[PDB]
Structure 1
């Protein structure tokens, strides 16, 4: 019925039975019961910057546009209650304008605020769990409100409880953020290490990060994409050691649990996949992990190319990449790994 092309950054042109913009929590709950009473599946979307529509969605797509930014003062920090429909970068830009630093490393990350805790948005040595106080959700079937604390969200690398037992039944309506008044700059990543720690300000980091991302990362407006198509593979300590014996120059960081996060873009580049094209789908020439809609790409083309990238990295390194972009079937979420396997 209705084209989803304007509602996803990848530029995939599939149809949805019905599309509605929810301005508040109750309108989202109302749109749920109706579609659910009609026997339709319901998909809660934000800005669509990390979704891959595989085919026509045979249901209702509720676009979360719940606005609001409340500020609460405590002696040692600022507490922000932000609506799920708020643009993330606009919020990051707003907080720095009001003199509330903390989100400057997460600048220019696309998508809404409601989607930020789902895969714990992270960039330049900072993740959302660092500043997340809580996340508000409504049980879609009943309309009952639930406030999960930062600990209850079970944040990990591109992972949270909203990708598991809170995935299907719940819709995020608000996100709580704690910004410490005693600001501590995170400058241990890339070209931010070249900033002077003694004189660095939140705005200098924000402007630096925005310039780094604009010049280096692929823009969906030039060629449609959903950021990094694959996650940076988090492998075991022994698996990382065996790989580093053969490939000692492989970029890697040790994790809290003792696992090892390997660079996906590096592994893909080492297989000579830059510029590889399956139809309209293409691997970007700078950021190899970013798949792009180069020329009227089918959703099959992207899945076909993603499989080919996964297989070549798998045969060379014995490391099997998992998609960070979420795959949407005809009736809702599907296993992205099983689709590319």
Structure 2
């Protein structure tokens, strides 16, 4: 590998937290993952796999081997007429991957445009946006099993995809994703449904609504709402949207008339966590070098040189303050290390 000893991780996590790793390693392919894995054992260290570090909260120096996935390769596997199965290596940067697909003439990823991170990490959290989740186009992946080292294929059912969840987040540290295969489409009628994405597409003339168009749109909305971690350290939205049983829903319902909620198919209501945190007077909060954004209340930030623990403590403060005022527990989205 390109091994580095006791070296900072500030340029490796979108929060910008400066903690040291006992060893840093960059994996270019599967041969590099194997040896990196025999090191972590042949030096008694635990192994921490990272991609772009945009779903990751670091709180202490990492007495691990940190293995940054930098595997590279973007390929069409199959071409059926209306569906195309593509495959990309784990370290491939996600958004350029999206551009690659649109370049090739394919739809399916367009609503996941400009999401940070790697292809390898995308199945971990089942990345979702603008009504689309990775499972909608997920076909299969290849993962290294860290109990015995044997590669196996995971079809879609086997991944137990959930809202910002998967078997790989349920069974953490077991599986190391190397490859991801998605089925993309051509010339499918356009997946858009009464939102700002549409409002702003149909203003452009909408001669034809190609995925490339909607992908151009979505970037623009992203570039206007979401804080860039290149200026304000963050890991995007910090809390998942909580969903409550119909009984919890009914009591909060007639306690706040606003209650931005969303009804699911199983009967229960998924509350807008942005509302909860904003109704809790948290928007624009700042204590020391951490806070929440002044617009998107879901985005916790490091204004400058914060610690992961401070971020972690603001998170916890918010969760209690919410739970102790509405009776809902906000779960986080990033993984804490």
What is the TM-score when the length of structure 2 is the normalising length? Answer: 0.93
Change (3 A) 1:207 1:76: closer
Q: Which of 298, 309, 314 pairs up with 2:318? A: 309
Q: Which of 135, 143, 147 pairs up with 1:129? A: 135
Answer with 95-104 or 249-258: which moved more.
249-258
Q: Equivalent residue for 2:39?
A: 34
Q: Which of 105, 108, 111 pairs up with 2:114? A: 108
Is this contact kept in 1: 2:113–2:218, CA < 8 A? yes
Once the two structures are TM-superposed, the CA of residue 89 in structure 1 deviates from its matched residue by 0.3
Is this contact kept in 2: 1:125–1:189, CA < 8 A? no
Q: Which of 54, 57, 79 pairs up with 1:73? A: 79
Q: After the TM superposition, which residues 135-146 of structure 1 pair with which residues of structure 2 at under 5 Å, given as runs?
A: 135-146=141-152
Q: Separation in 1 of the partners of 2:169 and 2:185? A: 28
Answer with 44-53 or 247-256: which moved more.
247-256
> Aligned pair 1:218/2:227, yes or no?
yes
Q: Separation in 2 of the partners of 1:103 and 1:184? A: 14
Is this contact kept in 2: 1:275–1:285, CA < 8 A? yes
Q: After the TM superposition, which residues 232-311 of structure 1 pair with which residues of structure 2 at under 5 Å, given as runs?
A: 232-311=241-320
Q: Equivalent residue for 1:175?
A: 180
Structure 2: which 5+ residue stretches go unaligned? 1-5
CA distances 1:265-299 after superposition (whole Å, capped 9, x unpaired): 11111111122123211111011110000122122
Q: Equivalent residue for 1:335?
A: none
Q: Separation in 1 of the partners of 2:87 and 2:316? A: 40
Once the two structures are TM-superposed, the CA of residue 214 in structure 1 deviates from its matched residue by 0.4
SS in structure 1 of the partner of residue 240 of structure 2: coil
Q: Separation in 2 of the partners of 1:278 and 1:232? A: 24
Q: Separation in 1 of the partners of 2:17 and 2:273? A: 24
CA distances 1:253-274 after superposition (whole Å, capped 9, x unpaired): 2224333211111111111112
Is this contact kept in 1: 2:105–2:186, CA < 8 A? no
Once the two structures are TM-superposed, the CA of residue 56 in structure 1 deviates from its matched residue by 0.5
Q: Separation in 2 of the partners of 1:297 and 1:190? A: 36
Once the two structures are TM-superposed, the CA of residue 189 in structure 1 deviates from its matched residue by 5.5
Q: After the TM superposition, which residues 179-198 of structure 1 pair with which residues of structure 2 at under 5 Å, given as runs?
A: 179-188=184-193, 190-194=195-199, 195-196=201-202
Q: Equivalent residue for 2:3?
A: none
Q: Separation in 2 of the partners of 1:24 and 1:244? A: 52
Q: Separation in 1 of the partners of 2:174 and 2:48? A: 11
Q: Equivalent residue for 1:338?
A: none
Aligned residues: 327
Q: Separation in 2 of the partners of 1:322 and 1:283? A: 16
Q: Separation in 1 of the partners of 2:74 and 2:266? A: 35
